[PDB]
Symmetry: C2
Subunit: 403 residues, 2 copies
């Protein structure tokens, strides 16, 4: 079983006070707090084992630590091979890498690409720049009122010119989990590849990219209780070894000549130019170990119970509008009466409750719902029923005071 009190003991930030009051951090979807095991694994590497990667001993051990983290990450998402994983800055850079290296040589004038109306900007803007570069069309799967995809529109959007579906696994605003396996079957029937944005999935339940059969999969370390500046791009081996490089420089070359040109090295490493973020890679590996030791199924069970408790308690908040489906994961998007989200979040911060307010990097989603902004509370593995009670009580107080 899961013990939230033992877990919280690993997270030093949770002891913090904000505005004189004890912090209730309900913004893990924007970025997750990190346990001491992750923080110290990075610090200890800098303290005792630091060197540049790729003869001498510290450098050879550091190179081996980084390839071990690549292997551990590939097992964490059940990729066939460690060499199907590229180290990137985060989800955003991973998507841009695919959009340029794979997009520029596989999406031509007159083609189309399909995204959804709930996509994070990370999974919109690189496809808009790709379509502008090659003269292709960006198609959009629209939303239902309850925050799910209008799956009936897929036949009018998929045709023989559809090169790619780029789709979120779990919405960072609505908490909707999309039916990826079926959508990927449909997409593959047309010869379309599928990129999955998994930035909000990998911390809530197990993820298996062989079962999903996605062609690309991306996520960020810092939302997986890990350090900033590191993330993972998974690509099917057969596609990856055909993709050209994106960033150029050291470590991604085989030979460099000023008169005979330059040749590239083999995949993953062809896509990793310059000094890797070894500090972040070390912290990411520790983050995967820590999460695996708790067990993603145990995390999923505790988070689902906490979510059901929260949705039940929030029924006692007058004039509360929720957005998204009842079976959401991770986040609760809401607005309080007619009050602007900025004001609501500001009162909640004043009680020491951290929630995010604004467009959540999902402006088309906001426009679909005809609001400028939303509040969002995240309910992660280290959050408690008591913090939910503080959120409920605070919204009630804000309603009485401002109503």
């Amino acid at each position: 079983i899961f013990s939230v009190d033992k877990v919280r003991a690993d997270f030093p930030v949770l002891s913090r006070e904000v505005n004189g009051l004890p912090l209730a951090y309900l913004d893990s979807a924007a970025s997750a707090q990190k346990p001491s095991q992750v923080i110290d694994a990075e610090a200890e590497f800098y303290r005792h084992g630091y060197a540049a990667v790729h003869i001498h001993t510290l450098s050879a051990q550091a190179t081996e630590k980084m390839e071990n983290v690549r292997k551990r990450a590939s097992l964490f998402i059940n990729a066939r091979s460690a060499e199907e994983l590229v180290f990137v800055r985060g989800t955003t850079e991973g998507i841009n890498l695919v959009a340029n290296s794979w997009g520029n040589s596989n999406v031509r004038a007159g083609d189309n690409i399909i995204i959804s109306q709930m996509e994070h900007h990370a999974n919109i803007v690189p496809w808009q720049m790709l379509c502008a570069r090659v003269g292709a069309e960006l198609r959009v799967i629209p939303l239902n009122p309850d925050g799910t995809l209008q799956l009936e529109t897929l036949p009018t959007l998929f045709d023989e010119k559809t090169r790619l579906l780029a789709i979120t696994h779990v919405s960072n605003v609505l908490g909707t989990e999309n039916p990826l396996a079926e959508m990927i079957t449909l997409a593959h029937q047309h010869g379309a590849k599928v990129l999955v944005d998994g930035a909000q999935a990998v911390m809530h339940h197990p993820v298996d990219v062989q079962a999903l059969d996605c062609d690309f999969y991306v996520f960020s370390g810092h939302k997986l209780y890990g350090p900033t500046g590191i993330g993972i791009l998974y690509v099917k081996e057969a596609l990856l070894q055909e993709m050209p490089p994106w960033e150029g420089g050291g470590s991604m070359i085989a030979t460099v000549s000023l008169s005979e040109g330059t040749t590239w090295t083999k995949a993953p490493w062809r896509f990793e130019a310059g000094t890797p973020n070894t500090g972040g890679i070390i912290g990411l590996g520790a983050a995967l170990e820590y999460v695996s030791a708790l067990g993603l199924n145990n995390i999923a069970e505790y988070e689902q119970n906490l979510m059901h408790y929260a949705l039940s308690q929030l029924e006692s908040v007058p004039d509360l509008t929720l957005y998204g489906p009842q079976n959401r994961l991770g986040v609760i998007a809401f607005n309080l009466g007619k009050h602007h989200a900025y004001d609501v979040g500001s009162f909640l911060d004043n009680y020491g409750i951290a929630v995010r307010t604004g467009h959540h990097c999902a402006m088309p989603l906001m426009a679909y719902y005809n609001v400028p902004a939303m509040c969002r509370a995240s309910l992660a593995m280290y959050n408690t029923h008591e913090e939910v009670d503080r959120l409920v009580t605070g919204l009630q107080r804000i309603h009485r005071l401002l109503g």
Copy 2:
């Protein structure tokens, strides 16, 4: 005055043992060790102040810490304005950013770009990919035997079609410091812009980009006694606010619409997509503080004396070939007799002496000297006369044993 013993006390890695013997780390040019003040500033941020950047309190304080580091970095290199600095992964990503955002809209078919024969691959490969994309020509300033540029060839290389000179401040192999101010005057007389690769300069002496009048300047945090995964790209305000975005996604947009297109936000931030590497940014700011507190002029004086001692002592090594000028900064590139550098570096590692062997991401430089590889010892602010003595003695032993 400088006290190397007090400085070394800040660096926990220096206590390490390698192969049972005390470490002599002479590979700071590949990556620098970090002081506790840098390591702990990052750890403490994760422990007590962590949040996503850009209403609630932790997030507002984190956003302010990152913009303070941007300001501190701009003062460190004497840029006019903090908004002339873009946070990048490192030198390599900074150069690729310029090559794509600025290069693609300013270098056309039939134009030419000038680099030097001593450039790191980071400052070659992105210009080769740019020239291949737009149909331009890559011109090369050749070397003199002593490791300096053949400055006489500049009139045959600069013409009216020269769009850009990309040039290293200090060679990572030879330790040559190039006459940047004069070369930038010449380049500007033709309407050419100048990118300076400063990755080997910013830790050895003060750097002033207003005095240099360079148009772009790049360096890496991890060689500046800082964390991995962070670096700085400086661009003159007038050029930067004309440059289009490179990576797309959150935080670099002003508005995102699926029907009316997307607009971009103002410079620096237009070039920073997705979650910044706040952990690395915090560590970088601490690294700049630590180096400023020692004083770059004090570092330069101690490192120059250590270098003169090393070059004098190495005269007692039979069959030692040195590469580069006598007034080198930071590094000593050498080969021992006819022995391959890999073997020499392997014996030195066995004595607990870390040097780098290989092409040092400078294959054209190696070919100029008609060798496949070189050894390189770095002499940084925390290295000692005693470690030089260990290097000298070790090379002597290797010569006797293998000669």
